[PDB]
Structure formats: structure tokens, C-alpha cells
Design a protein around this nucleic acid. Structure first.
Lengths: 159, 191, 111, 171
RNA sequence: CAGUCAAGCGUUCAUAGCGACAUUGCUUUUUGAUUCUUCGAUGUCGGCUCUUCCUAUCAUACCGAAGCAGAAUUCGGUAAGCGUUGGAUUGUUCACCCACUAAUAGGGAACGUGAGCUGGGUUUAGACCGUCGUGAGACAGGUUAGUUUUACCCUACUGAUG
RNA sequence: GAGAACAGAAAUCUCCAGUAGAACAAAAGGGUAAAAGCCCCCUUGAUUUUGAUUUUCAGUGUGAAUACAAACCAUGAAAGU
RNA sequence: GCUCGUAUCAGUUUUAUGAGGUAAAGCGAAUGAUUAGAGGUUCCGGGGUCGAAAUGACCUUGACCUAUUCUCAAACUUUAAAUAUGUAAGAAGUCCUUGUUACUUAAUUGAACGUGGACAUUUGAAUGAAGAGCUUUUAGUGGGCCAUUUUUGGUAAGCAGAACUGGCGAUGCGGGAUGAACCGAACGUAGAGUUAAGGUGCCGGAAUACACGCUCAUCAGACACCACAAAAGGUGUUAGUUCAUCUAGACAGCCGGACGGUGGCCAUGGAAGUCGGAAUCCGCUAAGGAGUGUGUAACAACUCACCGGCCGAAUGAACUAGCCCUGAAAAUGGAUGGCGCUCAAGCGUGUUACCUAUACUCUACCGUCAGGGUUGAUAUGAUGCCCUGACGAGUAGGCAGGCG
RNA sequence: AUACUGCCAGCUGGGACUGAGGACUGCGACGUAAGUCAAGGAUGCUGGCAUAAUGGUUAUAUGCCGCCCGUCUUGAAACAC
């Protein structure tokens, strides 16, 4: 009848890549993970041990444990009307550092520097981010930019 | 597309007079007087110099500018009938049974009587319209002449004879029997 | 929704007529500068026209002033909507969307 | 309602690589400024690679008719979509202003081809004042020398339901 | 059941009459598909009887067209006004023959019509046979016998007073 | 593909191309090239104790699987597995 | 109810950062299908020649090659969206001779957890937050059905089965005549005003309004869901491209027809053209041919190709799509809701005015919830008196105040 | 000059509905003075009747609405019970 296996409907998900098959490059093994690191999950179809489930493919979690060849990840999974905490033991081939946290740490350092400059002078550094504001007034000239009048084109078959 | 102004010219000979009230045309001339009602046409008339009359339609569609020239031709017909008249000559076509035509008067009405059409015992009676004169033309066998002023009544009497002489239950491609109009012309032609 | 760019005139009329503040989760009519000062004086907004100015010339405390302003309960437009059917875009001959500056006419009709 | 004509000038959003883009202009017949800007962006999206998000509108101006109380002939090239295909048509009309010319052109398209506003592109409105350039007979008909016509069958409107004498349609 | 296009048939000739390969459709007189109503029951097959309706017209009225000479036919139009039978066999609907006829057209009305009939069939219980089953028993297989209730009410109808 | 003597389109086949078009017990899909394929050498980690975790999930069971701990082993020069 | 009191939040956006393999696209990219078209030693499907013999010699599918795009894929794909989706945007945070350890390191190198220090009026996007964290316990339910959308089976179904959703059930109200689900809008009792959807000839409240067109039907048409119509047609009518010309004049009808050397091509039954091939010698002109058709075979036998007079300035061919018509046949009598309507009261479109929902605005009153005030010498049993702001649909079901 | 938009804390009218609250309290306005006011909710004047006149109840008539309850059910006025 019906089939719901562990790797059910993962035909394209774990498919390796185009012209990226075979042995994996060594930077993934050289990367180190500490407790509290934020990691993206993307299973390597080539390595079959410690492979995450198709649910956790594409999920971002927090490291809670570090072992010989793998790492423990905390993922909040929506079960019904709540989130449950799920602990995965995934290999570094399927684990990868998440860049959102890295960008935020860089911003934290930038705010620290701007606050130091504010303590130096006091020039209203305005740490907080702002959305894209509406454009202010501007003046557009016509030197070599005289408006070119356009008109709707008549219909043609073209075939 | 609402043509703004369409007008035609009806020519009036030197002997006839057209008296036109709202839409009642009366043409008088040497032969007689002919009257026609045109209240259904919605047209206008304007006499120019007593020799031409302009018949006009303002802001008319296709179906109105058609009727304009139609009534111009009808007035042509009345003037031509009052000047020269209309003469419809019809011949008798028969293979075996000769058509016997007579003019009879039941209560004085000048019916045309057709007998022996394909040799049947029925006599075909057709009345004659007022102003239509019947003449059994000599010098030609089996010819009848219908003469008058109103081409409408003359042609309708000719059509009445032709229609009453229809062949039934036979192949009319072979049974060519009947009275057919062979000439449509004028009483005073070439005068 | 129907939205657009309100003018100083329409904003002042909105605040003066249908102007209610949110004080301790309660909708109280402005009707006096005392309560506006009491609830927005930390930000320098000491009058109804101070609040109007903060709303119009969108200021540093626009968020606080606007949130203090209770949502405006407008009536139906008094001259109608000007369209047979509302729930088409303003471009399509409807009502919804961005009537860039015609929101002033619409809102002054509803207010 | 009443159509107006707007000149709408807009450009692509200036980038550092290319400051001052080419700043194209159109003439848009529209009900108001909002619809004028919307139609400008519609046609710009149809011609060049730009949309409202990726560009800006630098000018919108009402073009009033030069002499709005003189009678001239208008040739309107339009493109419209039927229930089956797309067709270009050319019609000639008579009005005092271009905006009313386009308004009655839209009425005419709706009446004769059931073409709604959405399915019509006004390719061009050109004013011709010289005859023998007019090609439509329904305009050449009123282009007649010393033209004069009557208005037969005048129907007079009555505010009271009942009339006490039989009406006359003389004019 | 009806169209559209015509490769061809029709000695010549696509369209008098047809018409392949394709293709567009029409109330459901078939039969399916569905399971919405009814299982504190809407009496079932056919026939008989009787009224009415539809038209996609068999005949009759009047016409158009033919590969319509005449007779006889065939194809169409307006047309449901008016008719559309008697029988052998079968419970039959359909059949199929004998005839008459102007013609023996097709259908609907809760597959019209059982407090209208009938009860031949189907469809309880009796019984026989064949095949099947160890058996009890089964078999839209065949045979034979098998209770057909009530209106006096309201409407409708038909007549009758007032 | 060019090849030997019987010998042939399909033995024995030396080179040249060869991204896997092969093979991997089986269904299909994924995966794999100095290998996960084919040979060769060694072997019994298909071992012990009990926990944690993922899937189905009620976050119950069953089945399967994942990463460790503490042992005892195999293999390798070793890292390791 | 408990612990607290505006935050250890959010069916939302933004910024930053992942994941995907559907739509689309692609097939002179892999797999698999798939139509055509040049040249290839016949040891390498089947067919004749110099002749007792084959590489000194040609055509028929293409086996096998040549990179030429004819067309495709739910179980094919290099590429690859939109929508939806994971995480982060801080005080449990960011940076320092350090302190602990049996883990880890060659090593006070790391790992984890810290003591001591620097961060304020912006504590590190937006919007909101009619309070936030739940604890216990228990009812009913566990037949569902219907939308626009994505979609499977089926010819299809008011069929059967699944998609982020919204509804009916469980729900009245205004509109769609009528209708569980459509549109509008959700409901305390009243009053004014304004509206939504839908409408304004009369039924019927509200313009027989205004404006431009189109349409005449001997089955008109009349507003979504929805209560149906098609292919094919029509000098019905309306609106939309090219060719000949336009002072070198553009159709239809009434009347005329034609030259000189040319009179060369079939058996001995017949061509200036009709079952027939070679095409270039000269001509003053307002009209004239080695040649364009219906079966006496031969000059005479019925037309023309440039043509001319007539109260001469546009016609001819194809096509597109609006309304209308044909296509258009079912049973009791009959339904744009009815009457009726024809420069509409029909169809397309465009201002505007007007009508009216239990909706919106504003008032009164009722109740519920909540946030508060209130210790006063008598005349008040302090949720007593009072200030308040918001809210009110409801089956199954729960709970509370009461009435008998 | 007029259009057409926009603004006026610009002026002049014509109608309708409502009048909650009830012993000083507040915010304001008026030549900046005691006072006044349209400023935290209607007062002033006047008439008729003092009764079935208003009103309640009740029966009918009229206009517009209104299907038979209970139940099972996705769905009941049901030609379901």
C-alpha cells in the first residue's frame, strides 16, 4: 500500500549535485564546532552515517554537544500546537556554520566601535538599524538627457 | 452610418403635375390621375422649378437611404404611367390542350376566364384591377394585352393570371404549360 | 483598505474631531491639553497641536504619539464612495488601494 | 469620468554605475494622476526593462489643449484585444479637445467592439486640420462646404405627467 | 437523433440521393455511472381501460427539389388539426408472421394508469427435475399450485341545489 | 577501435580512448573511481553493560537507525575504521 | 485559578543568512521518446554488371558515423522561480595578567563553567501587544459538507478523493425573485445620519436621469455563483489591412466589332484557335489578334483586348470581430421574478443624483468584563455609594445569577 | 480675468433627531480689573386640557413581513419520523 520510510521522498533532496559528486573537500572536516554554535543542516548524500532526516534538511539549530566525528544539534520542531525540542547527532559533513549569526556578531563589534567613538566625541551615532526610508527630494536635469517620448507599439504577428 | 443628407431628383415632364400633401402623392397628366400613399416611408419633398422635385432623407441609415430611391422609382412609375402607360403582353404556352380565355361579367366586374388549361374541367377566374384594360391582341395567336396607368395593378393582374395557371403534381420542366408575360412596355411607345 | 497621503488639514481635522487617546488601556477623548500632556509629556508633546505636528512632520516620537492616538472610528463617507463597487483597486474604478492624495477627500467625507 | 492628458516623465532608478538614466516620457490619457502614473508604468514595463519598484517618476503634468474651443479632425491609431486576437485600428473623429476625443473614442470602441478600457492601447492621437487627409466618410460627411441640415421630429421633454394638448414634433 | 467539411459513389458530375477520414452538438423513449430523497414501506412486469401532452411527421392538407416524361417513388418546408387497426405464437416489453389499411410514426405523463381491474409472469411458504453440494441447501435454470384489503373525509372531477 | 594461427560479430586480446554509459544479494530511488567496484592478506565489532537520540509518534509501543561512555577485540605502518 | 506586572511575545513586515527541484524552461545538454533531409571501404540485412574470379567501378533501410534544433516526458533533466518555509536581529549580550578540572593539549595550549572589570538615557530593525507564564480538571466532538484556487481517478456527474484558505454546520440581517454555503455584512433595546452588496418604468423605496454608439429577432435580449448551447454560416447591419489609378478619368447598363504581305507542320478521313510544340518580321490611327470560349471537319457561322455617347469622381477582391439571424427537437400551461419594454425599461461604455442592512458614526438605556475612587461626629449590613472605558451572534457543551 | 484643484482656527442661511447629568469644584473666552458667557450634557417664555385627551390592554382593519413544532441529519416546510 503506502510507504513512509526513513528516506522516503528524498530522491532529489539527497542527490549530490551536478559535477560535485564523490569525495568531499577537507575544509568541512577542518571546521570546528563549539557548544552554542549555530549550524545549518544540509545532508551530504554521499556520506550515509549520521545523516539527518529529511525534516531537518535545511533547518538551522544550536550545538549542544560535541563528539569524535559528529555534533549535537538542538532543533525546535512544530508538533501540533507547540514546539518540541529535538536533539540530533549529525556528522560534520551534513553540518555547516550559519552565516546569519556571523553577520550579527560583526554588527555587534561595529556597534561597540561606534559607541566608543560616541564616548570620544558625542556625535549622535544612532546605533539602531532603520528600514529603507522614502526617498528625499532630488532634482533631475536634462543636459544630454532630454526626455525621449515613448508610445505603445502596434501589434505584429512576428511569427 | 447616418448619412447626413441623401437626395434624389424626380424629373417631371412638361405635361404632368404632382400635387403632394404630407405624404399623399397625386400625379395628373394626359392619361389620368394616379394617387399613392407614402406615410410609411418617412421622407421629405421639395419642388425646385416645377420640372424637378428633390426627394430627401436626413440622417438616415442604409435601410432608409434605400427606401428613398425606392420611392423615387415609384414616383417615376406613376409619372410614366400617367404619360405613356404600361402594356404587359403575355403569351399562352400549351403542348396539347389550347388555353381558352374569355372576358366575362358576373355582376359587371370583367373577370378573366381561363378554360382547358391542361384540359381540366375547372374554370380559372381572375378579377381585373380598376384601371386595367384587357385586350385579346390580334395578328398573333394566343396573346393577351394588359394595359393601364398603374404598373402595380397591371403587373399584378399579369401575375394573377400566371399564378392561377400553375401546373400541379407534374414536372414543370416538361409541362411548360401556362400564360407567361413576354413583354413589359408602354402603351404610347415610339409615338 | 483605502490609504493615501494625508494633509496637515485633514490630519488636524481628524485629531480635533475624532481624537481619542489610549490612557491606561482606556479610550478617552482628548478634549483638553491636560491629558495629552500627562500621557505624552516625556516626549515633549504638550498639546493637541503638538501631537498633530508630531504626526504630520513624522518625528522621533511618531511611534509613541501615533500609538497614544486611539484608532480613528470614522463614519461612512457622507457623499458616498463615488464608485458603484468598492472592492476594486482605485486604478480600476474601485476604492481599495493607494489614492495617493485623494485620501484627503475620502477621509474628510468620512470624518 | 472626464479624461485628462498627462505628460509623465520617469526614469530608471539612478545607480552609481550609471547616474542620470535616459528619463523617458509618455503622454497618458487617464482619469487622474494616480491612474496616469499607473498607466505610465504599465507601458514602460511593456517597452523597456523597468518597473515601479526599479524606477521613479520625475514629472507629471496636465497637458491642456492649446485651443480647446476650435473644431479639428483627429486621427486615432489604437490597438485592442478582441475575444480572439489583437488588432490595430484607425478611426477619425471630430471634437474640440484631445481628451474629449479620446473619451468618445473609448465610448465608440466599447459600443462597436465591446472593447473595455483595459483592452485598448491608444497608439497615437494626431490632429489634422487639412482635408483630403481625413479618410473616414462619417467625418468627410460633416466636412462638407456650407453644411446645413435640419433636426426633424423634435421631442420635447415634459416635467408634468399629463399634457392637455396633443404634442407637436415640429422644429 | 441532428449538424459541419467533402476523399469518393452516383455512366460525366463532391453536395438529386448519398457520403469515408475527421469533427461540433441535442430532451433523456436505452443502458450504464452516482447514491441526494424514501427501509416506524411512495404497492412491482405486462396487458386491459381512459385522458392528455411532445414532435424527431407514418398517413391526410398545401408546397419546394429530384438522376421528377406519365404512374409510382425519394429528399425537404409549414404543419400534432385529424387518424395511426384486426389477428396466430409468447406472461412478455420487444419480437416475428398473416391480413386489412389512407397509414398501420416514434415517445412522455412517478419506466401515466392494482382503494381502476387482472394476476399470466416475477416474488414467501407446498412439489418435481437437471447441474452443483458430504450435507443442510444453492441455481435472473426449467416446471406445477399458490388470500390482490379500506374512501363515508378534503381537494380535483362529473352532474345537482342554493 | 586497431588486434592472433586455427578462431568465426559474441573464447584466447596487446595497446588506444573510455565521468562510470559497469558493478555493488534483491524492488526502485539515491550513493560510490588510487572506491563503496574487482582481486589479494588478515579477521569475527554480527562481542559486553547499560543509558541518550532520530523516524512513525500519543512524542506510547514495536521495527529500524544515529552519536557517544565504559570495556574487550579485529585490522592497519599509522592516522583511523 | 496560581506566579508575577508590560515582559523568557506575535497566523505580520524588514534586514541578514540557509534549504527546496514544483511552475516555467531544455532536448545542435545526460536518460528515454521523436520527423525529415549530404558523403562513407557490402569482411558489416536482403537486389544486376568487365564474366570461370572478389577492393580499377552505381543506386534501396539505414546497422555504424557526421552536431544539422520537427516535436515531447507524473514516475527525464544542466538551469530554475512565485507562494510557502528554518534561523538570527543582545544584558542568559560583546571584549581582558585570570580561577577550576581526573577531560583535552607537545605545552596554563584548548573545552566547559566562572570571580574580578568597560558598556545610560537609543540595550543594538518595523508594527502591535483591550496584560504575560501557564497549572489542575472536566464537557461535547471523533458521519461532516460547500466556495475562488492547486489538484487525482473518471467521458462526465448536484460523482469519488487530496492542496496554505474562507465559510455552512452552529447564523440571524441587506442583496442574488426563490436557495445552508454566493455578494455585502455578522446580531443587546431604541433614535437620528451615512452607507455596503444590490438597485431606481410599475409591482417596489429610489433619475421614463444625462451622454456616445450598437441591435429589430415570423423561437430578440436583459448582469457573476446560476439554473446552459457548439462547430459551421449570412451584400442583415456596424466598425477594422493591400492592388489599379487618380487632370496619365474608377465600376454598372443601353449599341459595334474589325486591316494589308500568312492561306507552311496528321493518314492523302480535319485548324490563323478550341486532345497539339518552334514565339519576332513592319505599319501614319478616335476600334481592330501567328489567337481568349459553348462539338456542321475547312471564308461566310454566338463573345472579346485597348474601346467610344449617355442629368460620370470611386469601385472591385480577400479577411477580422460587435449585435442580430440560421444552426436551435420533448412531452400539464409558464415564466429576464411578473407586468411589460424597441433613439428600451435590451447590449457596451462613461460622468452624477437618489434608495436602503441587525454594518459604520453619534446619543439614550440594559447587561457583561476591566481599571479605579471612597474611613466619613449621626442617616446606611464598603464589590454599600460612585468614576469609568470597552464589549454583547451562537448548536453540542460548560459555568454563573436567579424564578417556581 | 475665468476654469479646475487645494486650504480658510472664512461668512450667511433652511431642516431633522437628541437634552443624558443634577449642592458650588475643571479647562477656557470676553477693553487684562469686580462680572459675564455658547466654557465638565436645556433652559426661558406661552397656550389648551386635567380628561380616556396622552397612554396601556384588547378585537378588528390596513402596509410589509412570517412554512410545523420536536428529532436524527452535511442538509427538514418537507413527498423523513
Amino acid at each position: 500500500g503506502k510507504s513512509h520510510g526513513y528516506r522516503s521522498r528524498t530522491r532529489y533532496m539527497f542527490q549530490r549535485d551536478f559535477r560535485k559528486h564523490g569525495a568531499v573537500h577537507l575544509s568541512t572536516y577542518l571546521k570546528v564546532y563549539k557548544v552554542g554554535d549555530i549550524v545549518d543542516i544540509k545532508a551530504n548524500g554521499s556520506i550515509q552515517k549520521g545523516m539527518p532526516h529529511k525534516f531537518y534538511q535545511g533547518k538551522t539549530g544550536v550545538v549542544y554537544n560535541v563528539t569524535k566525528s559528529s555534533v549535537g544539534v538542538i532543533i525546535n520542531k512544530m508538533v501540533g500546537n507547540r514546539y518540541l525540542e529535538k536533539r540530533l547527532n549529525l556528522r560534520v559533513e551534513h553540518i555547516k556554520h550559519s552565516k546569519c549569526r556571523q553577520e550579527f556578531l560583526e554588527r555587534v563589534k561595529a556597534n561597540a566601535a561606534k559607541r566608543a567613538e560616541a564616548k570620544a566625541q558625542g556625535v549622535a551615532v544612532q546605533l539602531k538599524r532603520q528600514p529603507a526610508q522614502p526617498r528625499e527630494s532630488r532634482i533631475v536635469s536634462t543636459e544630454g538627457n532630454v526626455p525621449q517620448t515613448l508610445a505603445p507599439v502596434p501589434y505584429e504577428t512576428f511569427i | 452610418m447616418k448619412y447626413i443628407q441623401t437626395e434624389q431628383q424626380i424629373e417631371v415632364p412638361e405635361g404632368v403635375t404632382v400635387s403632394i400633401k404630407s405624404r399623399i402623392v397625386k400625379v395628373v397628366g394626359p392619361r389620368g390621375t394616379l394617387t399613392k400613399n407614402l406615410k410609411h416611408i418617412d421622407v421629405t419633398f421639395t419642388k425646385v422649378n416645377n420640372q424637378l422635385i428633390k426627394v430627401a432623407v436626413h440622417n438616415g441609415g442604409r435601410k432608409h437611404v434605400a427606401a428613398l430611391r425606392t420611392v423615387k422609382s415609384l414616383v417615376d412609375n406613376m409619372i410614366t404611367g400617367v404619360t405613356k402607360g404600361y402594356k404587359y403582353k403575355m403569351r399562352y404556352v400549351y403542348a396539347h390542350f389550347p388555353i381558352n380565355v374569355n372576358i366575362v361579367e358576373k355582376d359587371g366586374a370583367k373577370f378573366i376566364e381561363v378554360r382547358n388549361f391542361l384540359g381540366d374541367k375547372k374554370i380559372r377566374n381572375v378579377p381585373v384591377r380598376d384601371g386595367v384594360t384587357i385586350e385579346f391582341s390580334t395578328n398573333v395567336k394566343d396573346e393577351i394585352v394588359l394595359s393601364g396607368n398603374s404598373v402595380e395593378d397591371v403587373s399584378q393582374n399579369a401575375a394573377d393570371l400566371q399564378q392561377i395557371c400553375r401546373v400541379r403534381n407534374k414536372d414543370i420542366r416538361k409541362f411548360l404549360d401556362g400564360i407567361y408575360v413576354s413583354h413589359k412596355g408602354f402603351i404610347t411607345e415610339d409615338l | 483598505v483605502a490609504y493615501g497621503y494625508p494633509s496637515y488639514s485633514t490630519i488636524r481635522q481628524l485629531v480635533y474631531k475624532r481624537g481619542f487617546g489610549k490612557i491606561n488601556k482606556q479610550r478617552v477623548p482628548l478634549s483638553d491639553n491636560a491629558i495629552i500632556e500627562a500621557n505624552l509629556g516625556k516626549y515633549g508633546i504638550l498639546s493637541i497641536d503638538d501631537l498633530i505636528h508630531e504626526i504630520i512632520t513624522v518625528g522621533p516620537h511618531f511611534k509613541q504619539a501615533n500609538n497614544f492616538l486611539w484608532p480613528f472610528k470614522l463614519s461612512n463617507p457622507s457623499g458616498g464612495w463615488g464608485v458603484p463597487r468598492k472592492f476594486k483597486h482605485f486604478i480600476q474604478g474601485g476604492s481599495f488601494g493607494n489614492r495617493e492624495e485623494f485620501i484627503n477627500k475620502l477621509v474628510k467625507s468620512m470624518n | 469620468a472626464h479624461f485628462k492628458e498627462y505628460q509623465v516623465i520617469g526614469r530608471r532608478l539612478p545607480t552609481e554605475s550609471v547616474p542620470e538614466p535616459k528619463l523617458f516620457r509618455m503622454r497618458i490619457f487617464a482619469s487622474n494622476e494616480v491612474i496616469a502614473k499607473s498607466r505610465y508604468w504599465y507601458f514602460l514595463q511593456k517597452l523597456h526593462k523597468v518597473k515601479k519598484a526599479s524606477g521613479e517618476i520625475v514629472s507629471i503634468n496636465q497637458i491642456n489643449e492649446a485651443h480647446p474651443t476650435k473644431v479639428k479632425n483627429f486621427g486615432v491609431w489604437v490597438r485592442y484585444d478582441s475575444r480572439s486576437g489583437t488588432h490595430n485600428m484607425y478611426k477619425e473623429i471630430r471634437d474640440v479637445s484631445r481628451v474629449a476625443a479620446v473619451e468618445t473614442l473609448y465610448q465608440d470602441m466599447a459600443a462597436r467592439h465591446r472593447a473595455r478600457f483595459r483592452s485598448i492601447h491608444i497608439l497615437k492621437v494626431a490632429e489634422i486640420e487639412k482635408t483630403a487627409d481625413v479618410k473616414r466618410q462619417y467625418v468627410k460627411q460633416f466636412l462638407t462646404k456650407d453644411l446645413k441640415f435640419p433636426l426633424p421630429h423634435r421631442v420635447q421633454k415634459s416635467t408634468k405627467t399629463f399634457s392637455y394638448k396633443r404634442p407637436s414634433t415640429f422644429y
